[PDB]
Subunit: 248 residues, 3 copies
């Protein structure tokens, strides 16, 4: 008998806006500890992982663990019916076939309730390994978004080169090439053990940056021979992480 009330409901709005173009359908793993989503994107390239801890909700209750199969476009459409000031409650019965979503304001003059048909998805839980990241860059999320958008007018791929002093983003294509150098100082901070130079598809990074509204900061974690992790903190609640294998 799952139920979860989130006074800052706009977090859910932004979460769906940051998932709906990447994933068509995904399983929401609901448990005592919180809400978790894990899915490969629809092209089977990147893996997206969302954590929303029970403690970041204003009320939270989960009697039995649920795997809720959700069409993300549908859920996105329903969440567009919530205002940015709305208190949002999620509610599903045991062995649920629908998810209820209730939107309200403090003044209770407008109350909306939606019911979303769930899907049957017997998806398996993938193991996400832990890695030693020889290089971790924290920077303003908006500057990251800007760089990925700008450089995708030049080529399809971005070389990210990281050293103690600064981080460089480079691209090349038909028209020529470019590179963008950010020095360490919102700040740019680099925690690095060994320099890395890795190449990534801009198409996928430009999908990840739809998470920009969740945080003014993004963390890029990278190491040779493992996926890049692009991490947006969801304040006092958890995170959205995107994983992208370098181009080999």
């Amino acid at each position: 008998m799952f139920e979860a009330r989130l006074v800052q409901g706009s977090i859910l709005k932004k979460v769906l806006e940051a998932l709906k173009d990447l994933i068509n359908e995904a399983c929401w793993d609901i448990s005592s500890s919180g809400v978790n989503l894990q899915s490969m994107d629809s092209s089977h390239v990147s893996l997206v992982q969302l954590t929303l801890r029970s403690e970041g909700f204003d009320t939270y209750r989960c009697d039995r663990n649920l795997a809720m199969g959700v069409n993300l476009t549908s859920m996105s459409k329903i969440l567009k019916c919530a205002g940015n000031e709305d208190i949002i409650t999620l509610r599903a019965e045991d062995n649920a076939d629908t998810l209820a979503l209730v939107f309200e304001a403090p003044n209770q003059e407008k109350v909306s309730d939606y019911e979303m048909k769930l899907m049957d998805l017997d998806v398996e839980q993938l193991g996400i390994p832990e890695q030693e990241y020889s290089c971790v860059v924290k920077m303003p999320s908006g500057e990251f978004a800007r760089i990925c958008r700008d450089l995708s007018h030049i080529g399809d791929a971005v070389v990210i080169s990281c050293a103690k002093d600064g981080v460089k983003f480079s691209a090349s294509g038909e028209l020529g090439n470019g590179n963008i150098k950010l020095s360490q100082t919102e700040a740019v901070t680099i925690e690095m053990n060994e320099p890395v130079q890795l190449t990534f598809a801009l198409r996928y990074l430009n999908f990840f940056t739809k998470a920009t509204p969740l945080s003014s900061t993004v963390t890029l974690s990278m190491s040779a021979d493992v996926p890049l992790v692009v991490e947006y903190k969801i304040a006092d609640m958890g995170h959205l992480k995107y994983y992208l294998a370098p181009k080999i």
Copy 2:
């Protein structure tokens, strides 16, 4: 020798913006009492009725009654050439083949004049019956627009249920369903003799809401077995009314 000067010319701009998607061609009935338009929309579903009383114009003169056949897209295009601060004069000769439109500002530094070819439309005047509306809801026009837009992402039709205490808008479709409850308190006011529950096509309501800029308030009048009336007041001048039969 029709002539009409409207210092608040932006009213005409908004009137055309609220008609041009619904109607291709329509007759402007000009008479001593004022300007009236009546037309079925281009799909022959809803009826639109505009009243602009002679008294709301700053000057007004009509020697002989005229039926001006107008392509509304064309008139819309000409009215887009008026600024929002413009004084607008309409002028047509007796047995007119063209309508003149003059746009000016107080400072007279820019004066525009347009001439629009009229059309030949021998359309008959339809009788719009009077009805007893067992239920009349006054609410903010923007909230009405929001609800119709939001709910049309859920289904094609909206059930409007009205009672003393409040008004509910519901929709259902493939993805699931939703309902939006507004309580009586811009306010929400309900004057009702008997509860109504009626169903309407959202496609047409979303056309009516293009009239939103004419008023901060909309009036919904409904009764069993007669069209819904969606009414936008045009301050100190008249109205724009849209009529839509429930789905049966």
Copy 3:
């Protein structure tokens, strides 16, 4: 060994935004005196001429005269990677095959450098004759843009009639016709020896007005039997001029 530093880099951004829809490819004539571009548009109708004098750059150096063949769409794409506050340096070696563009800010926290492949274009320099313009209209660039946009909803051509007292823009098409009268007074100023009445394609004027951000003023120079000149000053630096033959 050409190099040019422009602290107000946004001038270059606006220059490219005012050329890229009109011209695909064009030669940048670089010399001691400054940067000049001359090209027929891609339809071979209008001629565009850009002058940026060496003196308007913060530093300027040109060892040998260069004709740089540039795809303007490509250069436009690179200049979109510059911020509006950016210092912009252009750099090309002798007998250059690439153009370097460096973007920086005062605080040097972000430095970008791009390299653009040049093209081989053995275009000849066209002689632009001098003419006696019997009529010169100075007016606000935004009002010019407004008029050309508005009137292009009425017809494809604009009749520009100029007299001592004022300037009139007229258009006619299927729906009817219109004219817009501006009186002499940002001001409207007319210096005229003889009245002119000339007709011009609105499609091309609406391309010229993409230069609007370079200046709050536009100068229209016209005479019977020679092209209209539409001139946008590039403050303390030079100009962008567009030439358009009247319709005959």
